[PDB]
Amino acid sequence: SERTFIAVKPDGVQRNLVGEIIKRFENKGYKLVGLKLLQPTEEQAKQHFYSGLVSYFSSGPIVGMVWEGLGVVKGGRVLLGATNPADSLPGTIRGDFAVDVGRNVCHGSDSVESAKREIAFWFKAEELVSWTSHSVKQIYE
Amino acid sequence: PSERTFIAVKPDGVQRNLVGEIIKRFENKGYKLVGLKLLQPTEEQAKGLVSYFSSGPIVGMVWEGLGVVKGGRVLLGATNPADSLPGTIRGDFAVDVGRNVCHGSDSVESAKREIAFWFKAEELVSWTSHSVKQIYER
Amino acid sequence: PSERTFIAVKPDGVQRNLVGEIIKRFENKGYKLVGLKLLQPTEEQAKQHGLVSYFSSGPIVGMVWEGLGVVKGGRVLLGATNPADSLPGTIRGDFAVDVGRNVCHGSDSVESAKREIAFWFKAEELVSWTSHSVKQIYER
Amino acid sequence: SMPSERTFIAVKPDGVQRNLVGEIIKRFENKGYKLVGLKLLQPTEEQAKQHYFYSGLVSYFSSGPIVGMVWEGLGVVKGGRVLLGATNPADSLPGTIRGDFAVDVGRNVCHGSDSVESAKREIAFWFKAEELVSWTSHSVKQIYERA
Amino acid sequence: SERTFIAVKPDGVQRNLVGEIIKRFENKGYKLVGLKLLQPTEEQAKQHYIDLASGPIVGMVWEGLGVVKGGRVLLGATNPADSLPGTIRGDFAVDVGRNVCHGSDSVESAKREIAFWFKAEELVSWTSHSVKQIYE
Amino acid sequence: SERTFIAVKPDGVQRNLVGEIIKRFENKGYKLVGLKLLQPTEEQAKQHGLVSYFSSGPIVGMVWEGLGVVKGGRVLLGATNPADSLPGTIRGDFAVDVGRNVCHGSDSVESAKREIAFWFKAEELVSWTSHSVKQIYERA
């Protein structure tokens, strides 16, 4: 089943939005199969204006997540809201919580291919957990 | 404002503990609860879709308010959860169209039919909200 | 575990839009909803339950909840009967001020729960079903 | 287009009566906007006449208290209105204040300045300069990107 | 009819707890009769400084039956270490020196605090449309 | 700089309480320095019927930092036995059965050190400073 990479960026962790973000994905019906707190290294930030974006991204921890579900790549992005918080609607994470595109609190993979790459980049295979939600028959026909 | 609509928490909604959450959103909006009942549809009432619909309880509700048929549907969000926006019930809580948590009458006429189908007249309560002048100008 | 209790949102609770909030808390706790009904008590029903007039003046929501220790646990969720003594986090602690407008009711014992359930609900109105989360809430 | 931009937000009397003051303030705080003015007041008949059916809207608006607020942040005039939702609740989407809480355009719970110029005028009309408080949020670097 | 003074201290305002605190008082059934974002005046500071020998903050006045004690119950114990979850400080504070809010500790001190922070003309007397639902 | 170990047990993960639990610790002012989703091995559960349930699915392991966080974290979780947990706590709000009590927190500073070391390798913990430290602590 489809998987996507969702991150709480360092502004999101600093502003105490980790639980709130996780809650919204859980409530939606998506399944958490990877989760990790980490501080990106400068080198990881270099791979991911330049000195500035690198420095912010390696300045503090992010929370990396892998979520599983039908249409979760697109759906996860819908939950996050438009990338640019000026365009984000209330009810979304960015619409509720962000102002500035450079401090937009979170990230979600923008396609299936890019999800596979991002998951592989941040998570070793052994760190992902395959399990079955006891609610699968209530969420999916 | 005396328009009425039928809202249901389907069995997946009840199983996933969304009854209170749904009621809350209608109450917050300003709509008035005039009928409420927990029931398990019979196979016959349902008559794959039949089996799921008669497999467990639903919560049936009648809500009253100005434009409540359309408004109730806006609160539920698009019927197909792929199209539902966050902030709506389905946008927040549903993934699959076949397990889309809830239902709202799609028109005034079909609301009248649905209400009559699930509720006996005596089961609906007419009352006046002490907030009516705060919610409606006239 | 199959224990059951009667919970009511009194008319002030319904008027003040607390029905959903109360149901949510019971659902969140893990208790199972097996009866639910909106109704306006008759004066006669209020007599059995000034207090008469208020109680029969508008609708209440009657509920039956099932779970281990649900009679006591339901009352703990409601908070002390007198809101002056109710702690924040409970329904009355969060939402009520006056004992005469204390928003809700819960059966005070197993025996009185059986009586209250039987009084407000006909047998055919209660639904027996199994939560898909039963093994996540209960070890045995 | 400055982060120092300011807008006027009001909880109208219906919003105060229906206990939506805290909820409205929370949404602005959550968004990252900064509260620089706040005041509970009952508009006078004369103040209601200027603000705006010219029998009826006046009477309701001067009938009880409103909460007046000044919020500061990048694009806060437009952003504040997005949080409130469409002016007519029929058009307001869930997730917004009016989409979540209002039904009738005549009882639409709140108000926000519709432009930068009208925000300056509204702020000046409801607040004396000495009532606004300038301070710095300890989260400014988390909300706004430094070059 | 009783009234009390509740304040969101500067840490509370900085940490975005103003709405959350107001909400809890509204939800409880108490009535907001004074509200203002404020900075002490030089004259207010002088008199505070003198009185201790016996910003911004948000200042509030709330009205209701038993609101002085009730308001404090909503805030939770003064020292957050002792505050229980469900209260403001139990949910949101760790350190007694950054305990987010304040409520008058008695009826007499409420009168004094209200008078100190609010001019009489800044309080609004009004009737909640829900008064008969909250009070018998 | 005190630290404690908090876990969402498998029932808690299954019942979608991870975010809710994290939120409460964040709201309180505590600082997240370790976070990981994992499925305990049978061997790991033996050291911690109870073995089978604990190794049956994923838990979320967390390390939190703050003044008095060991005791404070337990106060947020509520009494170990949900029958005794008060509303406003995680177990008071969400749990019924002591065998399915949703979560765990270290019971002392010494046991927190042991539990943190057991579940987290040193390189998995992140040391950082909250931009709100001076708003949460007077001495910071």
XYZ file of C-alpha atoms in Angstrom, chain A:
141
model
C 0.000 0.000 0.000
C 1.057 3.596 -0.838
C 3.450 5.477 1.463
C 4.596 9.071 1.832
C 7.197 11.046 3.783
C 5.924 13.786 6.093
C 8.274 15.994 8.096
C 7.770 18.566 10.827
C 10.475 21.081 9.929
C 12.509 22.756 12.682
C 10.113 25.732 13.017
C 7.286 23.213 13.481
C 9.166 21.341 16.213
C 10.188 24.634 17.899
C 6.570 25.834 17.812
C 5.242 22.616 19.400
C 3.234 21.329 16.427
C 4.465 17.718 16.377
C 1.613 16.157 18.282
C -0.942 18.292 16.435
C 0.391 17.166 13.055
C 0.527 13.484 14.013
C -3.018 13.706 15.421
C -4.437 14.955 12.139
C -2.918 12.088 10.163
C -4.116 9.542 12.741
C -7.586 11.051 12.765
C -7.742 10.919 8.973
C -7.203 7.126 9.042
C -3.623 6.993 7.815
C -1.225 4.526 9.382
C 2.107 5.475 10.973
C 4.876 3.099 9.806
C 7.945 5.225 10.501
C 8.755 7.943 13.012
C 11.966 9.523 14.159
C 13.239 12.715 15.748
C 16.574 13.893 14.257
C 18.752 16.911 13.639
C 19.745 17.058 10.025
C 23.478 17.381 9.508
C 24.843 20.210 7.359
C 25.604 17.528 4.783
C 22.007 16.223 4.830
C 20.794 19.819 4.469
C 23.200 20.412 1.506
C 21.616 17.390 -0.294
C 17.992 18.440 0.516
C 19.514 31.718 -0.753
C 21.591 28.508 -0.195
C 23.724 28.957 2.933
C 20.599 30.244 4.622
C 18.193 27.383 3.857
C 20.974 24.860 4.725
C 21.737 26.553 8.007
C 18.040 26.694 9.134
C 17.371 23.112 8.182
C 20.419 21.813 10.099
C 19.889 24.173 13.108
C 17.636 21.910 15.130
C 15.585 18.775 15.083
C 12.884 17.749 12.596
C 10.410 14.854 13.003
C 10.451 12.504 10.067
C 7.436 10.285 9.460
C 6.284 7.648 7.027
C 2.495 7.289 6.548
C 0.626 4.576 4.730
C -2.826 4.596 3.152
C -4.845 4.819 -0.028
C -3.863 8.032 -1.829
C -1.709 9.081 1.126
C 0.838 11.044 -0.971
C -1.816 13.472 -2.331
C -4.005 13.189 0.811
C -1.116 14.005 3.140
C -0.440 17.131 1.133
C -4.075 18.126 1.300
C -3.864 17.828 5.148
C -0.741 20.031 5.150
C -2.419 22.666 2.956
C -0.862 24.724 0.088
C 2.905 24.938 0.272
C 2.715 28.730 0.456
C 0.843 29.636 3.646
C -0.652 32.694 1.944
C -2.647 30.178 -0.155
C -3.381 27.666 2.630
C -6.955 27.340 3.831
C -8.008 27.153 7.478
C -8.457 23.560 8.567
C -5.100 22.639 7.078
C -1.849 22.568 9.065
C -0.347 25.527 7.226
C -3.645 27.382 6.975
C -4.004 27.144 10.750
C -0.385 27.584 11.841
C 1.938 29.215 9.255
C 2.481 32.656 7.738
C 5.728 32.624 5.761
C 6.616 30.201 2.918
C 10.178 30.011 4.343
C 8.793 28.904 7.737
C 5.970 26.663 6.570
C 6.173 24.214 9.431
C 6.127 20.948 7.523
C 6.723 18.958 4.353
C 5.072 16.145 2.444
C 6.376 14.265 -0.589
C 5.001 15.734 -3.800
C 4.704 12.464 -5.748
C 4.920 8.708 -5.476
C 8.485 8.625 -6.918
C 9.673 11.427 -4.717
C 8.052 9.751 -1.675
C 10.052 6.581 -2.347
C 13.241 8.643 -2.581
C 12.544 10.694 0.547
C 11.594 7.669 2.631
C 14.778 5.889 1.532
C 16.872 8.987 2.246
C 15.647 9.510 5.832
C 14.857 5.953 6.929
C 16.791 2.712 6.831
C 14.523 -0.182 5.814
C 14.836 -1.741 9.262
C 13.349 1.404 10.820
C 9.956 1.071 9.141
C 7.352 -1.084 10.880
C 4.779 -3.123 8.962
C 1.607 -3.730 10.940
C -2.129 -3.928 10.485
C -4.512 -1.469 12.063
C -7.370 -3.113 13.922
C -9.540 -0.483 12.157
C -8.620 -1.367 8.552
C -12.075 -2.890 7.748
C -13.742 0.264 9.173
C -11.598 2.617 7.067
C -11.482 0.642 3.778
C -14.085 -1.272 1.903
